[PDB]
Ligand binder design. Structure first.
Ligand SMILES: [Zn+2]
Ligand SMILES: [Zn+2]
Length: 338
C-alpha cells in the first residue's frame, strides 16, 4: 500500500529506468501527493550525474511537482485531500530552529531534506514531502505550466524580494535558456527595464517580444563594456568575463547567481568597493515566498512556454533538454498505470 512507481538512475550517467520502491508508512509530518506534472531542469541532470557528490543511488529525480494531495499525516495544517499543491527543491525542514520558526525554512540549520537528494522526487506516480513544503496552488493557475515556477520562477522571484527591486530599476539577465526566459517574463510583470545578454544574435526579435527592452551580444566585449553602470541587479544563469559584467552594475547594484555553478568566480575587491556593489546568491525559496509567487502568477501570467512529454518518455525529454532547443521549459505529464 506504500508502493511508488518511479523512474530512477541506478548509477551516475545511466538512462532512467522503471523503478518500484516501498516508501514505508507516511509519517505524521508528511503529506503524499499524486503527481500530475513535473518539470525537468538541469539541476535534475546534475543530481542524476552526481555532479555535486551528494546523490544517493538509486535516485528518483524531479523537483518541479504539481499534483493533488492523496494522504495527510496527522500533523498537517491547512491542507485537504484532493487539493492541488506544488513541491519544489525542498521536501522537509526541522520546523524548530531559529530560521524555520522565523519563516526562513529554506535556510534551516537543523535537519532538512531536499526533494531529490537522499529523497525520492516527482518522476514518480506519488511523492511525499513535509506538509509545510506542499505549496497550495490558486485554483485558476494552469497546472501544466506551473511546475517550473517552483524552481526557475522562485529563484528569480526571491532576489526581486530580497533586493527590494521595483519597476523603476533596470535588471540585466545573462543567458536566456529556460531560466532566462522565466526571468524576463517575471521582470516584465514587475515593470522593470530589462536587458537580456545573449550570445545568439538571431534571437533578438524573440527576446524583445518576450519583454526585453534591450538585447546585448554577450560575446561582444565592447558592447558589454558599453553597458557600464546600467544595472541595479544582474541575474546570471550561466555556467562558465566577470570583471566586465561587474562593471555593468550601477552603484549599489548586485550580481546575483541563480543556479549552482561549481566554477569559482574570481572577484576583484576593488570592483565591489568602488561602487558599493555586491555578489550574492539565494536558494530555492521558503514557503511564504513560494505561496506569494504562485498567487502573483495567477494574476499576471508569468508561466513559461513549455514542451510536454509523457513521463514514460523521460529519457527522450532529457535528450531534448540537452539539445538546447527547448522553448523553453520541459514538463513531464504523469502517465502511470492506475
Ligand atoms: Zn528545476
Ligand atoms: Zn529548521
Amino acid at each position: 500500500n506504500n508502493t511508488i512507481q518511479a523512474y530512477a538512475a541506478m548509477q551516475a550517467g545511466e538512462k532512467l529506468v522503471p523503478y518500484k520502491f516501498d516508501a514505508g508508512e507516511l509519517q505524521p509530518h508528511q503529506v503524499e501527493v499524486k503527481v500530475e506534472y513535473c518539470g525537468l531542469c538541469h539541476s535534475d541532470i546534475s543530481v542524476l550525474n552526481n555532479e555535486w557528490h551528494s546523490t544517493v543511488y538509486p535516485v528518483v529525480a524531479g523537483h518541479e511537482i504539481i499534483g493533488r494531495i492523496v494522504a495527510l499525516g496527522s500533523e498537517a495544517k491547512g491542507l485537504q485531500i484532493g487539493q492541488r499543491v506544488g513541491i519544489g527543491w525542498t521536501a522537509e525542514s526541522c520546523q524548530a530552529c531559529d530560521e524555520c520558526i522565523g519563516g526562513q525554512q529554506v535556510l534551516c540549520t537543523g535537519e532538512n531534506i531536499a526533494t531529490i537528494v537522499g529523497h525520492a522526487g516527482g518522476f514518480a506516480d506519488k511523492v511525499r514531502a513535509g506538509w509545510q513544503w506542499a505549496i497550495p496552488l490558486p485554483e485558476d493557475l494552469d497546472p501544466e505550466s506551473a511546475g517550473p515556477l517552483l524552481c526557475g520562477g522562485i529563484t528569480v522571484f526571491d532576489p526581486l524580494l530580497k533586493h527590494k527591486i521595483q519597476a523603476t530599476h533596470h535588471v540585466g539577465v545573462i543567458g536566456i535558456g529556460g531560466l532566462g526566459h522565466i526571468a524576463i517574463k517575471l521582470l516584465k510583470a514587475w515593470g522593470c527595464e530589462i536587458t537580456a545578454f545573449s550570445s545568439n544574435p538571431d534571437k533578438t526579435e524573440e527576446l524583445k517580444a518576450m519583454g526585453a527592452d534591450h538585447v546585448v551580444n554577450s560575446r561582444d566585449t565592447e558592447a558589454v563594456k558599453a553597458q557600464k553602470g546600467k544595472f541595479d541587479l544582474l541575474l546570471s544563469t550561466v555556467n562558465v568575463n566577470w570583471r566586465a559584467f561587474i562593471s555593468t552594475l550601477a552603484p549599489n547594484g548586485s550580481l546575483h547567481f541563480l543556479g549552482l555553478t561549481l566554477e569559482p568566480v574570481p572577484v576583484s575587491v576593488g570592483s565591489l568597493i568602488d561602487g558599493a556593489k555586491s555578489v550574492t546568491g539565494s536558494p530555492t525559496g521558503s514557503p511564504a515566498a513560494l505561496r506569494q509567487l504562485l498567487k502573483f502568477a495567477a494574476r499576471k501570467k508569468i508561466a513559461p512556454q513549455i514542451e510536454l512529454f509523457p513521463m514514460s518518455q523521460l529519457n527522450e525529454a532529457i535528450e531534448r533538454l540537452h539539445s538546447g532547443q527547448a522553448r523553453y521549459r520541459i514538463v513531464l505529464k504523469a502517465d502511470f498505470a492506475e
